[PDB]
Amino acid sequence: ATNRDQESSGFAWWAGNARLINLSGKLLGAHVAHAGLIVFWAGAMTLFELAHFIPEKPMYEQGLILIPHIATLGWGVGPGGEVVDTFPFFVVGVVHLISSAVLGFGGVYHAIRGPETLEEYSSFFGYDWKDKNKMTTILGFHLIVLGIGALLLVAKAMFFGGLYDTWAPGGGDVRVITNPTLDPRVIFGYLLKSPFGGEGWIVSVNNLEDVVGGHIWIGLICIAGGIWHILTTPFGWARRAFIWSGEAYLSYSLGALSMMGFIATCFVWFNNTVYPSEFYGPTGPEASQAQAMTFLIRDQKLGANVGSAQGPTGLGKYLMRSPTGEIIFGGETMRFWDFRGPWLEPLRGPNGLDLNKIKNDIQPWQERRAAEYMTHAPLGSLNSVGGVATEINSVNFVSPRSWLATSHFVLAFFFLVGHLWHAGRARAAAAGFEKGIDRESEPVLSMPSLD
Amino acid sequence: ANLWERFCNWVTSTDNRLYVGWFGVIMIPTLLAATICFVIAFIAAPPVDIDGIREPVSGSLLYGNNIITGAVVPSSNAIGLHFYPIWEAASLDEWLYNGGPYQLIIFHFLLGASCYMGRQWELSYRLGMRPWICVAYSAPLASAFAVFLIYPIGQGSFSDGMPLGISGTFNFMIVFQAEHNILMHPFHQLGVAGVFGGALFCAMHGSLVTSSLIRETTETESANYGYKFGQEEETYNIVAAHGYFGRLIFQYASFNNSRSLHFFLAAWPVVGVWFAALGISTMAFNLNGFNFNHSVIDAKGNVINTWADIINRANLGMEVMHERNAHNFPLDLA
Amino acid sequence: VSYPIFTVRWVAVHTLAVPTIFFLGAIAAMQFIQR
Amino acid sequence: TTGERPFSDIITSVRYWVIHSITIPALFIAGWLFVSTGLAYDVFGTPRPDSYYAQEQRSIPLVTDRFEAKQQVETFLEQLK
Amino acid sequence: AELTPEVLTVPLNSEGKTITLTEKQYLEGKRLFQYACASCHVGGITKTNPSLDLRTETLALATPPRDNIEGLVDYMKNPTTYDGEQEIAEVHPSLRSADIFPKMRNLTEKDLVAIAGHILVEPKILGDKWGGGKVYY
Amino acid sequence: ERGWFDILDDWLKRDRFVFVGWSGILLFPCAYLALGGWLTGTTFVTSWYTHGLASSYLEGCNFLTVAVSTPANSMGHSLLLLWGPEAQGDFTRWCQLGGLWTFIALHGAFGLIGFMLRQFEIARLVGVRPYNAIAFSAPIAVFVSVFLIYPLGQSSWFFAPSFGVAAIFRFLLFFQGFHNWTLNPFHMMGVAGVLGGALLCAIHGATVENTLFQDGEGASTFRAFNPTQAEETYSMVTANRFWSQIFGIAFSNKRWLHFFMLFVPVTGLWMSAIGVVGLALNLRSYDFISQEIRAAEDPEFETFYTKNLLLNEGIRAWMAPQDQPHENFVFPEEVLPRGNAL
Numbered sequence A: 001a002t003n004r005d006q007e008s009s010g011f012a013w014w015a016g017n018a019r020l021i022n023l024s025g026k027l028l029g030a031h032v033a034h035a036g037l038i039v040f041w042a043g044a045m046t047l048f049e050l051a052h053f054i055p056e057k058p059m060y061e062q063g064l065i066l067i068p069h070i071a072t073l074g075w076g077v078g079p080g081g082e083v084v085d086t087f088p089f090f091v092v093g094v095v096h097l098i099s100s101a102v103l104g105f106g107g108v109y110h111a112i113r114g115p116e117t118l119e120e121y122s123s124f125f126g127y128d129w130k131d132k133n134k135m136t137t138i139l140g141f142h143l144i145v146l147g148i149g150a151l152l153l154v155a156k157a158m159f160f161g162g163l164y165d166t167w168a169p170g171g172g173d174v175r176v177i178t179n180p181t182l183d184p185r186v187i188f189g190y191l192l193k194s195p196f197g198g199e200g201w202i203v204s205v206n207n208l209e210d211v212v213g214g215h216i217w218i219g220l221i222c223i224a225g226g227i228w229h230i231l232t233t234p235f236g237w238a239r240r241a242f243i244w245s246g247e248a249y250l251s252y253s254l255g256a257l258s259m260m261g262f263i264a265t266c267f268v269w270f271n272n273t274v275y276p277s278e279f280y281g282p283t284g285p286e287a288s289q290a291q292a293m294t295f296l297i298r299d300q301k302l303g304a305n306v307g308s309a310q311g312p313t314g315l316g317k318y319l320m321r322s323p324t325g326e327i328i329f330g331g332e333t334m335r336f337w338d339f340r341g342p343w344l345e346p347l348r349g350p351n352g353l354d355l356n357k358i359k360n361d362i363q364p365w366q367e368r369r370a371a372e373y374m375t376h377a378p379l380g381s382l383n384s385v386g387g388v389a390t391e392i393n394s395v396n397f398v399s400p401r402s403w404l405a406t407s408h409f410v411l412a413f414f415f416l417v418g419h420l421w422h423a424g425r426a427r428a429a430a431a432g433f434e435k436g437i438d439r440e441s442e443p444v445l446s447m448p449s450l451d
Numbered sequence B: 001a002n003l004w005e006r007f008c009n010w011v012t013s014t015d016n017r018l019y020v021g022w023f024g025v026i027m028i029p030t031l032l033a034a035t036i037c038f039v040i041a042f043i044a045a046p047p048v049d050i051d052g053i054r055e056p057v058s059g060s061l062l063y064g065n066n067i068i069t070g071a072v073v074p075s076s077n078a079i080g081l082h083f084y085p086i087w088e089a090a091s092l093d094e095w096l097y098n099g100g101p102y103q104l105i106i107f108h109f110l111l112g113a114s115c116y117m118g119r120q121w122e123l124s125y126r127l128g129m130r131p132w133i134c135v136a137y138s139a140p141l142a143s144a145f146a147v148f149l150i151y152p153i154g155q156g157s158f159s160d161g162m163p164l165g166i167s168g169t170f171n172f173m174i175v176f177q178a179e180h181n182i183l184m185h186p187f188h189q190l191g192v193a194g195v196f197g198g199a200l201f202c203a204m205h206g207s208l209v210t211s212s213l214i215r216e217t218t219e220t221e222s223a224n225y226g227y228k229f230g231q232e233e234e235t236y237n238i239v240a241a242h243g244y245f246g247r248l249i250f251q252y253a254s255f256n257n258s259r260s261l262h263f264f265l266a267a268w269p270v271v272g273v274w275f276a277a278l279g280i281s282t283m284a285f286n287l288n289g290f291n292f293n294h295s296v297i298d299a300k301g302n303v304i305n306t307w308a309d310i311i312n313r314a315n316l317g318m319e320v321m322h323e324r325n326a327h328n329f330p331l332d333l334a
Numbered sequence C: 001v002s003y004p005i006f007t008v009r010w011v012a013v014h015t016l017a018v019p020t021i022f023f024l025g026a027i028a029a030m031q032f033i034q035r
Numbered sequence D: 001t002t003g004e005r006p007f008s009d010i011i012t013s014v015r016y017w018v019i020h021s022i023t024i025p026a027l028f029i030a031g032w033l034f035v036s037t038g039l040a041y042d043v044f045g046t047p048r049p050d051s052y053y054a055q056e057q058r059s060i061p062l063v064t065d066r067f068e069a070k071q072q073v074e075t076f077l078e079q080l081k
Numbered sequence E: 001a002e003l004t005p006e007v008l009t010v011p012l013n014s015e016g017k018t019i020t021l022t023e024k025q026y027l028e029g030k031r032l033f034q035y036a037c038a039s040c041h042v043g044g045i046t047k048t049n050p051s052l053d054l055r056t057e058t059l060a061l062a063t064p065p066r067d068n069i070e071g072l073v074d075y076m077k078n079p080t081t082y083d084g085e086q087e088i089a090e091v092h093p094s095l096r097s098a099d100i101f102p103k104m105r106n107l108t109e110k111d112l113v114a115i116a117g118h119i120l121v122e123p124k125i126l127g128d129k130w131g132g133g134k135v136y137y
Numbered sequence F: 001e002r003g004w005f006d007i008l009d010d011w012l013k014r015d016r017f018v019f020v021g022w023s024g025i026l027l028f029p030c031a032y033l034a035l036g037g038w039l040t041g042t043t044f045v046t047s048w049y050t051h052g053l054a055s056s057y058l059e060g061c062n063f064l065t066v067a068v069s070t071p072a073n074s075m076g077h078s079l080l081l082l083w084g085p086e087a088q089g090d091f092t093r094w095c096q097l098g099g100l101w102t103f104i105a106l107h108g109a110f111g112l113i114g115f116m117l118r119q120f121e122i123a124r125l126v127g128v129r130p131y132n133a134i135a136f137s138a139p140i141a142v143f144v145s146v147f148l149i150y151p152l153g154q155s156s157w158f159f160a161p162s163f164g165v166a167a168i169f170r171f172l173l174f175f176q177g178f179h180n181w182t183l184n185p186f187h188m189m190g191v192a193g194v195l196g197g198a199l200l201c202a203i204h205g206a207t208v209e210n211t212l213f214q215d216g217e218g219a220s221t222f223r224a225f226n227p228t229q230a231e232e233t234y235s236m237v238t239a240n241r242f243w244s245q246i247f248g249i250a251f252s253n254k255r256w257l258h259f260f261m262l263f264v265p266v267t268g269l270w271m272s273a274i275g276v277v278g279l280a281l282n283l284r285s286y287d288f289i290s291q292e293i294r295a296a297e298d299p300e301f302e303t304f305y306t307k308n309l310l311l312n313e314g315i316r317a318w319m320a321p322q323d324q325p326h327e328n329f330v331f332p333e334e335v336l337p338r339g340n341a342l
């Protein structure tokens, strides 16, 4: 039971996994077994979603999060997001589930049967956290793997059938990307966009050419950087700036995953390009705009002149200006005038919403989509009663957007907490005071009084 | 040494009456900016068109408020989540009408308070302390972020951020109830358990330590004089306190370990308040409290109301009245 | 060494444990009631 | 350290389980039956799903008389049958 | 109070003929109304056009009259405006627009009758709450 | 010992798993009945006759929605004793009349008395000062003000809080719409003592855990403590310096610190109790008269205070007909306050 109690390891059972810090074999076991849990859930969850799936109801009325991910890659779907073939969903689910048994096998072997440390056994697989060279080398391998993953996405989009494109002219459809955006001024220009309203930083990406081109960049950057880290050792200023310890490295990764978690939350909440509304339901801004569109359509059918209709406040009941002059929907949705979506853009001219297009060119498919999106707004109760909070029971609905945003905000937040926990512990343990203050060397007793 | 080196030495000095530090280099100016703007707006700002419907709400003392009604009012619904710094406005007069001070204050305050949290880590490291006081402060800080940034982002507008004012705060609470049924949300319920239990354990701990202070003073002196700053000996009898509390309930319900006791004292409120913060931050994306409206139905299909339905009626009153000139269409979707 | 069975504690435990199990059986049955 | 047999002694002993593998299930089943027989409704005066309202009755049988509320409930209850 | 054969007895046609629906049909009508209709008509209102509700008195004054199984079944095949003047299949789910309203694709004749039966039965149970909106919650 | 009194005293005070005491004779049966009455009513008992509500697992409610509800308004402030003039010994009718409400409220009140007598009795036997009992006066002031004084000032027990999760939520919202209770400075002082107490609970636990002396080799530090040790487990001197430099002030006296931790939440609860005694009489902080005079004459004057009264007016009109069934309110649609569209 090598290190498997508090007396030996110095760590209580509830911090038991800290017993692994310097046991590279068992720690590799933990890691591989864990990757099996992730792959397991992906496969089992997909099969479950498929078993429950009624192809003619929208995905977003069915509590699906994984099928929508698969569909967006262009598997299983046709024009408008119509499901034409569930078999690809099946394949994805099965292949992950089978794969997780392999990973789970490796994990159990390393964790329980293999060498508890790897260093005696192998110098390629063994490691010391304080070995800066081995650390950047392993980091470099993983960078290359990630780079190849990003390029797989490019391969799908360009050579293996394309991606679902909500923006396809004539209507949403799978489309092969042939002219991916390579211009670094566009690709890196996204990184310098404001995260505030009407800008949206990277969340603003609104076409698949930029999406594909960015992963071309990212795949190349990751592979290059991975090579770089295999071939180099950290610079002096790097060595002086960081703590070099397993717990410190966990902490840097915790911060990064926290940040990424927050980013994903805003991505699923606002973006309707890589989270097509055909699959994920309308965004909050989209459904609110769809409501105004719905009543503009209705009342104008009844004979209202929607351009000149002054609402109770003096602002136009249907149509008003944004603070920079663009014609936008009125009522509370004035806040959502940065919204853009395929069903609405045909009505937009260089000055914003165009009154002549509004009066003459609204098609029945736009009315239908706007009514669908208004009535699938991402609002609903924790027990999945769809609607505002005062709604009566009947409609079993919570948008996949709310489930995905809320879950990722919770995760990203607790990951920030773990970052602070571990970054501050790593600092203290590196300096030697993580177990408490030395009673005979209490630093504050050697300092001058404040007053 | 060189100027830079001495500067760094000063910034990081353990000897300054108030610790500065690198977090402090950001915290000091941002907190000063938010404080000064807040005080001046709270006294003297003109009315702010919070809901973007040209219906300005008076927040400041000079424009007819008292301490309880006064607020710095959130920025205009017309702005939404757009960044509205002073230099984006044509004039200070426009900036004021549209609730510019609110954005200035809350952005500087959030940055400054996040740096306050970093600074707590920083000093603990300078003093050779363990590092997690800053993790306890993450709970109130998360809660401030939820109401001033996450909620507005979810709903698409800083006009739905919590106002900087006492009555404004209650306005935010009541509207939040109509829109999310927060009382019926388990994360807010855990927050209540966190703050009521924090109060409870605060009183409990205060009273148990106070009850077992070792006699060191006479009946004329405050017993507080029986403790001297920096003494080595513990000032109360924990075995006596445990002896009492273990009998009040039962032996194994009481801590005799002060470290476990103080960990519990930290953890209970901090965890509950993290769930409070995550309640607001996930209702930000409209995953709302439990809805049992019309859940109980008799043999014919008559609705048999429960206390949940009575809640619903109070929620409806809030919903139909709030921002009474701002809705033109039948659903309040953000 | 040699313990009493029935104590104030024993009584305390059963004043609570006994109705608890009875109630739990009642509430389980309830889950199959239809209107 | 107050004398009584330690709980963890008791609940890992064969004998505890001989007694309780019968008493626990018996209590649970009795609770079940208190509901499944309908008896719970009559002891507590709780309406069955078919007894909240008469077939065409408009309003709730609210008690409005302090000292004859008991009689009110009794009259309210025949007005179902 | 009970869900009796009488409560389940509704107008079959414009001429005063009735049909008594079974309890299975009642269950099925609620289920299918939730499936295909409640996103807009929860509680007997219409979210995207609140002027028109599913109350029986409103249905009776529609053209053709919709306060009977036949009129409701026909509405679900070929919906019209309230005056009977335009066909609105292109913007309202129907059998004839099952291509653009895919949830209509597997509704059978039997299912349409069940949903029509739910629309006529529910107000006999809920009275003014049916088609009442939030005032009656 | 001596006589029977002293032999009884002996047995009452035996050192056992659950201490009994003389207080135990009052505490145990009252607490047991209050708790069992709650579980009994929430599991099995309706509120159809008193409120027109289902309220038990038996009727289909869940843990959030069950309650033991108050008696009908026509019961007034009846003690509603099983053997009294209302139930006349009929247990079934007593349940349907809300008799479990006054059963729980009154046994609960005696039980709390017994609990606080317990804290005094055990303190005296162990030889500690009775500050825990003293702190417990705050729970007593809250329970007595809210569950007894408040409904006693109103028309009946009907308006006391009902014992249930959703029922208490309803009580909060009623107090907002009818009493504007958030505006009340005694409630505000309550809120300060609760949140300030939770603040002191967190900050004192974190500070001790982060100024610990290294008293063992373990990286899990809980074992490095002994209840009997003479020495402070953490450094008051270092904790003082840390907060002095972070916040500007710090505790330096541990005795003061711990008395302040009693003081803050205890005082806050006592302040909230006083505001509730005023609400028993509808003696509210509902309005600022200067605000109303200005707003009546100036239709462009708006504050968050005027906005909140509009919310209150909605709450009263929308909730009253179902929440106050004995009033037989019928509010035609046309009279209900509503803003535009909603």
Ligand code: CLA
Binding pocket: A013, A014, A015, A016, A017, A018, A250, A254, A414, A415, A416, A417, A418, A419, A421, A422, A425
């Ligand atoms: C990649 C992520 C990651 C990894 C590898 C680690 C790894 C480690 N952490 Mg960190 N940590 C993380 C993220 C991570 N943590 C996050 C996000 C937080 C914020 C909460 C923390 C906070 C944290 C603390 C406070 C501590 C550690 C400690 C440790 C060490 C021991 C962990 C252990 O044995 O737990 C054993 C596991 C348990 C006791 C189970 C925890 C149960 C959780 C809290 C409930 C989860 C609920 C679930 C999702 C839903 C319910 C399920 C169902 C049953 C109802 C180990 C090095 C300890 C230490 O510092 O060692 C150096 C320590 O004291 N971690």
Ligand code: CLA
Binding pocket: A002, A003, A004, A005, A012, A013, A014, A015, A016, A017, A018, A019, A020, A023, A026, A027, A029, A030, A031, A033, A034, A101, A102, A104, A105, A108, A111, A112
């Ligand atoms: C993702 C979850 C996870 C993973 C992957 C690990 C991994 C590990 N832990 Mg941690 N741990 C966890 C969660 C986890 N732990 C939690 C939640 C807690 C708090 C309860 C702990 C508390 C803890 C302590 C206190 C200790 C560990 C230790 C260990 C290691 C040695 C285990 C051992 O001795 O097994 C012995 C157990 C068995 C022989 C029972 C069977 C175990 C196997 C793996 C079951 C596999 C089942 C699976 C269904 C089989 C599929 C087979 C198929 C593919 C063919 C191992 C690498 C130990 C350590 O660090 O050693 C140095 C150690 O002392 N853990």
Ligand code: CLA
Binding pocket: A041, A048, A049, A052, A062, A063, A064, A065, A382, A384, A400, A403, A404, A407, A408, A410, A414, B271
């Ligand atoms: C990213 C994570 C994620 C997201 C966004 C979803 C989303 C969804 N799931 Mg999936 N799922 C997940 C992970 C997720 N799930 C996991 C891990 C499992 C294995 C248990 C499943 C297994 C599963 C099944 C079997 C089903 C779903 C279903 C659903 C849908 C309804 C969910 C619901 O009703 O919740 C109810 C809400 C809860 C149960 C509350 C969860 C709150 C947790 C306990 C709090 C977490 C706090 C934090 C992590 C703990 C920290 C402690 C602190 C001290 C540090 C929804 C689309 C349903 C569906 O419709 O399928 C089609 C369905 O049947 N899921």
Ligand code: CLA
Binding pocket: A028, A032, A102, A103, A105, A106, A107, A109, A110, A114, A115, A118, A121, A122, A125
């Ligand atoms: C990142 C995961 C990982 C890492 C770093 C290691 C590393 C190690 N393994 Mg473990 N193992 C793993 C996962 C891993 N293994 C999995 C998933 C399983 C189940 C299949 C096992 C089952 C296993 C056994 C049964 C044994 C080892 C042994 C070893 C050692 C020798 C390996 C070697 O020399 O191969 C040299 C190289 C090759 C044989 C060629 C590798 C071919 C791979 C499979 C090609 C695929 C490449 C591609 C990038 C895979 C992507 C996977 C991803 C999508 C999930 C070394 C310590 C041995 C050891 O412990 O000795 C005492 C040993 O006996 N492994």
Ligand code: CLA
Binding pocket: A136, A139, A143, A191, A192, A221, A222, A223, A224, A225, A226, A228, A232, A233, A234, A235, A238
């Ligand atoms: C997981 C990915 C990863 C990780 C963990 C590391 C880790 C490391 N890198 Mg490597 N690198 C990577 C990927 C990665 N790298 C890739 C893909 C490339 C190719 C582009 C490189 C190319 C590279 C070079 C050329 C160098 C490193 C160096 C280093 C070391 C210190 C870096 C540092 O101080 O950053 C902290 C960042 C700074 C100090 C920059 C200033 C801080 C600014 C103000 C932050 C602004 C960002 C802000 C939060 C906004 C976010 C979004 C924004 C882009 C708009 C460390 C070992 C250094 C080294 O030692 O090589 C041996 C070094 O010179 N890397």
Ligand code: CLA
Binding pocket: F025, F026, F029, F030, F033, F079, F080, F081, F082, F083, F099, F102, F103, F104, F106, F107, F110
């Ligand atoms: C110490 C324990 C204790 C206390 C303080 C209470 C207190 C109370 N109980 Mg509870 N009760 C208890 C234990 C207790 N109970 C137990 C063990 C049971 C199970 C049997 C109950 C079951 C119970 C029920 C079923 C009810 C109560 C009720 C009450 C209330 C009215 C009691 C009353 O008027 O008595 C009056 C009697 C006395 C005060 C005794 C006085 C003793 C004097 C000094 C001597 C009397 C001698 C006399 C002259 C001789 C006979 C009289 C002769 C003229 C005919 C009050 C809150 C009622 C309630 O809650 O209604 C809402 C109610 O219905 N209790």
Ligand SMILES: CC1=C(/C=C/C(C)=C/C=C/C(C)=C/C=C/C=C(C)/C=C/C=C(C)/C=C/C2=C(C)CCCC2(C)C)C(C)(C)CCC1
Binding pocket: A029, A030, A033, A034, A036, A037, A040, A047, A094, A097, A098, A100, A101, A102, A103, A104, A105, A107, A108, A111
């Ligand atoms: C280390 C450790 C641990 C952990 C462990 C783990 C984490 C593991 C994992 C594991 C895993 C991760 C596993 C997996 C497995 C899997 C499998 C075994 C699979 C199988 C599959 C199948 C069999 C399939 C089938 C099918 C098909 C093919 C089709 C459809 C249908 C079905 C689905 C039926 C714990 C915590 C305990 C603690 C101690 C230590």
Ligand SMILES: CC1=C(/C=C/C(C)=C/C=C/C(C)=C/C=C/C=C(C)/C=C/C=C(C)/C=C/C2=C(C)CCCC2(C)C)C(C)(C)CCC1
Binding pocket: A186, A187, A188, A190, A191, A202, A205, A210, A211, A212, A213, A214, A215, A217, A218, A241, A242
């Ligand atoms: C894919 C894609 C794309 C692209 C992308 C990209 C190209 C990205 C990039 C990215 C990047 C490129 C990022 C970066 C980041 C960075 C960071 C995140 C940093 C951090 C830092 C740190 C953390 C530091 C720290 C420190 C300090 C500050 C001081 C001293 C000390 C220390 C060192 C601690 C797009 C959008 C177009 C479209 C969609 C898709």
Ligand SMILES: CC1=C(/C=C/C(C)=C/C=C/C(C)=C/C=C/C=C(C)/C=C/C=C(C)/C=C/C2=C(C)CCCC2(C)C)C(C)(C)CCC1
Binding pocket: C015, C016, C019, C020, C023, C024, F032, F033, F035, F036, F037, F038, F039, F040
């Ligand atoms: C009223 C009355 C009385 C009394 C009665 C009694 C005394 C009763 C008791 C009763 C009881 C004594 C009952 C109990 C019950 C219990 C239950 C019903 C339980 C349940 C539980 C559960 C369900 C659990 C849950 C949980 C938690 C809490 C946490 C953890 C997790 C879980 C979820 C598991 C007399 C005859 C004198 C007279 C007249 C009236």
Ligand SMILES: CCCCCCCS[C@@H]1O[C@H](CO)[C@@H](O)[C@H](O)[C@H]1O
Binding pocket: A159, A160, A161, A162
């Ligand atoms: C690791 C996954 C290996 C399986 C890769 C499957 C190729 S994917 C395949 O490619 C076709 C074009 O060749 C597309 O038309 C089609 O949509 C797509 O399904």
Ligand SMILES: CCCCCCCS[C@@H]1O[C@H](CO)[C@@H](O)[C@H](O)[C@H]1O
Binding pocket: F002, F003, F004, F005, F006
């Ligand atoms: C319910 C207890 C309150 C009554 C206390 C009055 C005690 S009374 C007292 O009791 C002694 C035994 O203890 C006898 O020896 C003595 O003769 C008698 O006067």
Ligand code: OEX
Binding pocket: A332, B051, B077, B155, B159, B160, B175, B179, B322, B323, B326, B332, B333, B334
């Ligand atoms: O702004 Mn402030 O409050 Ca959130 O919902 Mn929509 O918007 Mn307005 O109504 Mn309800």
Ligand SMILES: [Cl-]
Binding pocket: B171, B175, B321, B322, B323, B324, F307
């Ligand atoms: Cl309002």
Ligand SMILES: [Cl-]
Binding pocket: A330, A331, A332, A333, B326, B327, B328, B329
């Ligand atoms: Cl609107």
Ligand SMILES: [Fe+2]
Binding pocket: B205, B209, F204, F208, F258
């Ligand atoms: Fe303390």
